[PDB]
Design a protein around this ligand. Structure first.
Ligand SMILES: COc1cc2c(cc1Nc1nc(Nc3ccccc3S(=O)(=O)C(C)C)c3[nH]ccc3n1)N(C(=O)CN(C)C)CC2
Length: 304
């Protein structure tokens, strides 16, 4: 019924992998998503581990279509830094989308919870943060080279495979892009729900979105990462941020942030989109920071 076009191919509900409901076991609730609970689940000795997004049985026609489009979007991506879709279960109620379980949880919570402290002093280092930044930039580069504008790149929408060393960060939420795809604008949301603090001036002023949109948001994600999970523009409201950013105002470096890292942020935040780097360049600059001993030997602040 609705068609979804990505990378010049059109897919429909008929292309999603319908997984038999009998093969799905819910284990525990993990919390609420934008519209519905999310569960840890299993798909069948050595079952696949999945996050299960559910559609409330009490919902509208548009919610049903929002849910379908979310499934179509994530099912057509193919990249190691974008959460995989195992399949769907749309023919039983409540309807399920089955995603690669990201056992480390969302990246914002991880940064807040794993901040170095007196009890666990070496929980994180500068290299961990650079690897997370690289991981997400690789996924953003994949979106950019396939002409997909994410529109909501932010730590809350990224997830980690596992809490400990070896973790890989991935883009896990596409709800903003889904809302725009269906109606062409933020019909579902409102001004108070827009991710103002992640958006460049031409986005919230003219509603113009390009891949240079995501470059700006990635700069803010970089600030979130190197601040260890602080809210951007600490004391400022959405409208204060809007006016601050349009006047040329930019965030200060996070505490202890190395200069070369801060300079990636400020390049992402150039007023003119043409002056911002693409994700190939961002990746080069992240890779160069990872090679620099003065960067990776910088100690993160310990939270008392
Ligand atoms: C053992 O596993 C987990 C254990 C925990 C989390 C996550 C996963 N694992 C996971 N969660 C996903 N979402 C998700 C999960 C819960 C609530 C909302 C969403 S959510 O709306 O999608 C959002 C990410 C935009 C996932 N989505 C795709 C894969 C995947 N894996 N927790 C958080 O993340 C806490 N945060 C939300 C504040 C809580 C502890």
């Amino acid at each position: 019924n609705p068609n979804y076009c990505f990378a010049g191919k059109t897919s429909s509900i008929s292309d999603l992998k319908e997984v038999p409901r009998k093969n799905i076991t819910l284990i525990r609730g993990l919390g609420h998503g934008a519209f519905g609970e999310v569960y840890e689940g299993q798909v069948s000795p050595s079952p696949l581990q999945v996050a299960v997004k559910t559609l409330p049985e009490v919902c509208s026609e548009q919610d049903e279509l929002d849910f379908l489009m979310e499934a179509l979007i994530i099912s057509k991506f193919n990249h190691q830094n974008i959460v995989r879709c195992i399949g769907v279960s749309l023919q039983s109620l409540p309807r399920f989308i089955l995603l690669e379980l990201m056992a480390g949880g969302d990246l914002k919570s991880f940064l807040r919870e794993t901040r170095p402290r007196p009890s666990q002093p070496s929980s994180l280092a500068m290299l961990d943060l650079l690897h997370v930044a690289r991981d997400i930039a690789c996924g953003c580069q994949y979106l950019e080279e396939n002409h997909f504008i994410h529109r909501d790149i932010a730590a809350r929408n990224c997830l980690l495979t596992c809490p400990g060393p070896g973790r890989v960060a991935k883009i896990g939420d596409f709800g903003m892009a889904r809302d725009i795809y269906r109606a062409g604008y933020y019909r579902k949301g409102g001004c108070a729900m827009l991710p103002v603090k992640w958006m460049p001036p031409e986005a919230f002023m003219e509603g113009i979105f390009t891949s240079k949109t995501d470059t700006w948001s990635f700069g803010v994600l970089l600030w979130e990462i190197f601040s260890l999970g602080y809210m951007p523009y600490p004391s400022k409201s959405n409208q204060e941020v809007l006016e601050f950013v349009t006047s040329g105002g930019r965030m200060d470096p996070p505490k202890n942030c190395p200069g070369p890292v801060y300079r990636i942020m400020t390049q992402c935040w150039q007023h003119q989109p043409e002056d911002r780097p693409n994700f190939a360049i961002i990746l080069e600059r992240i890779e160069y920071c990872t090679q620099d001993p003065d960067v990776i030997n910088t100690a993160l602040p310990i939270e008392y």
